[PDB]
Design an enzyme around this catalytic site. Sequence first.
Site, short mmCIF file in Angstrom:
data_model
loop_
_atom_site.label_atom_id
_atom_site.label_comp_id
_atom_site.label_asym_id
_atom_site.label_seq_id
_atom_site.Cartn_x
_atom_site.Cartn_y
_atom_site.Cartn_z
N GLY A 6 2.27 5.95 10.05
CA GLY A 6 3.65 5.75 9.59
C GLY A 6 4.25 4.45 10.09
O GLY A 6 5.37 4.18 9.66
N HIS A 29 0.85 -1.23 0.00
CA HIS A 29 0.00 0.00 0.00
C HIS A 29 0.87 1.27 0.00
O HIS A 29 0.30 2.40 -0.08
CB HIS A 29 -1.08 -0.05 1.09
N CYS A 62 3.48 1.40 9.44
CA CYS A 62 3.32 0.26 8.51
C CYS A 62 4.73 -0.21 8.11
O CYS A 62 5.61 0.63 8.04
CB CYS A 62 2.41 0.60 7.35
#
EC number: 3.4.19.12
Lengths: 305, 303
Positions: B143, B41, B145
């Site tokens: 942030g 993503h 991820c």
Amino acid sequence: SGFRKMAFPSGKVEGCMVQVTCGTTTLNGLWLDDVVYCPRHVICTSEDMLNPNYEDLLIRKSNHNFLVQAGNVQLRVIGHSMQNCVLKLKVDTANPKTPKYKFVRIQPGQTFSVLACYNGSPSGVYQCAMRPNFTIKGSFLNGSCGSVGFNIDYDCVSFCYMHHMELPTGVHAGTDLEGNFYGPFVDRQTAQAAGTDTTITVNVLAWLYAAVINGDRWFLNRFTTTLNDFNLVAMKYNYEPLTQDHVDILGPLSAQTGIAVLDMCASLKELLQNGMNGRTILGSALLEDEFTPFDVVRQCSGVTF
Amino acid sequence: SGFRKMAFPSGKVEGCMVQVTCGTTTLNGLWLDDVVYCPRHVICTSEDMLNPNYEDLLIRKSNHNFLVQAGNVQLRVIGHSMQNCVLKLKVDTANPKTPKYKFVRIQPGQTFSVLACYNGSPSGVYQCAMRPNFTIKGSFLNGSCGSVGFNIDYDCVSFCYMHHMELPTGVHAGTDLEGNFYGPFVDRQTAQAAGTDTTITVNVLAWLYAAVINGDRWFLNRFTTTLNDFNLVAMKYNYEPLTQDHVDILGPLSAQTGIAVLDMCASLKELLQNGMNGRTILGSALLEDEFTPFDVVRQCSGV
Ligand SMILES: *C(=N)[C@H](C[C@@H]1CCNC1=O)NC(=O)[C@H](CC(C)C)NC(=O)CNc1c(F)cc(F)cc1F
Ligand SMILES: *C(=N)[C@H](C[C@@H]1CCNC1=O)NC(=O)[C@H](CC(C)C)NC(=O)CNc1c(F)cc(F)cc1F
């Protein structure tokens, strides 16, 4: 979202842990620059540990009596001294992994990370608080002595704890890295009782702020109390007095949530007087006291090192 | 003595964390040998996070559209491919701090350490359990991820989790390092919710053994139970069935304490009936289910 008991990343500390053997006693040492720090009771034996004369035992010991292993490399000892309850072993080689560091003595209610070590090998890491009675509620087995506690700011490791012993209640006692005990304890094999403990009020308040930041609101109480009124009820429940200083420190968390400190005090008074009525806050049925106001700001705003 | 929610020491993983930027999206990547792993993503446009076609978004990217920063240094991307929900960035340099490692898919109830990261740097380390509904109860902001979950066995890091998303109830979902989601979750911002969560029974029993090993027996009683009668009662409190496999796994703890597993089962039934009556077990007023039998053995006997 979410709120977890987070330890500091341990990698700067992992690179300093070494094994120290004297006679048949093996424990951990902290290797920083060209010195190894470990508990002085590594020079003790079965015969001594009931009432040791450390002066006289260190006198009798010579460098070659100390095997220092950093992984598989054996470090050459060229010097031995004592500072309070810590042994300083000078070695021929500066640790190339020596991080930016300092030795800092913490106050009761402050938190730190423990790197639990066995044979100089880091096993695990956990966050705890220095109890108001100067004990820590640790997890420590045989061979854990010399395991250290630390905080990080930026790239600087602040070493605050070195592990020496377990009290009969299953709780733990140690020194700062200058060898000064936290609390009224001595390094010999005798049963020593900790003072009766209290709850770290400012930390329970910090954690109620964390709960509100994470949408846990059921306990909020619009009926403000006074510092005095709160402290009368706190004392009954074996909570530390809340000082104007503690009120200041909750300043940021108060601003960010818009909840007045004395309003969070009124909430806490009611939880104390009436329990949780079967409910939880942030997955706990107990009031959590091992998060400082700074710990909450750090976790909730994603501060990195 | 004592018992704590212990994480693995994080140093071997800190050495692998990088920052990955694609357009205006920055998250964390895992740099092992000459490959950086991150959530796919990272290529998602703010315009369409409901129904991205990742194969279409990726074919439009060049190597130079991915900015990988390992602290101070820019790494050169020489290749990119997608495995399931993970992007694999090939870089020209092997990570010199790459530990010994493997990629494992864990089962619900299994525990792991999370190194929570922002912009390729660590914020903290904590211990998690994969919930029966395939979520974790983490601590993750914007942030986070690309943060990973791991176990360490000797000197070998087993990566088992990469963080992708927060669900509307504040719990967290992610993939293994082959990019397969745990549970029915997808990397789209269409409405998703975790199934009702259950307690990991075999873990609650492991923890009760830990409480006995640490010298507390207040919650024991004189009774036993059949596995079937235990399961009929436990399921009324949203506990997971205990299986014969679970009973064999608790064998070591049973043998250390001299308490039969089905006797500890009787204790748990009474605790579910009565609650704590103002007492605690290992510093908790709830029954804890984020410790496995292996966790209790390693922590109680010699790590
Ligand atoms: C360091 N390696 C150990 C750590 C201990 C062992 C198990 N858990 C720990 O935290 N330290 C010691 O064994 C010290 C050594 C002396 C010389 C100070 N001794 C103790 O920990 C004392 N243990 C103890 C008693 F002596 C009496 C008690 F009633 C209860 C105790 F825990
Ligand atoms: C990665 N950096 C973030 C981590 C999030 C942000 C807040 N806490 C976290 O753990 N991941 C994301 O922002 C994802 C990206 C999508 C494309 C997978 N989105 C979310 O986590 C939140 N969005 C969202 C859902 F995931 C599911 C929903 F049903 C509704 C949502 F709005």
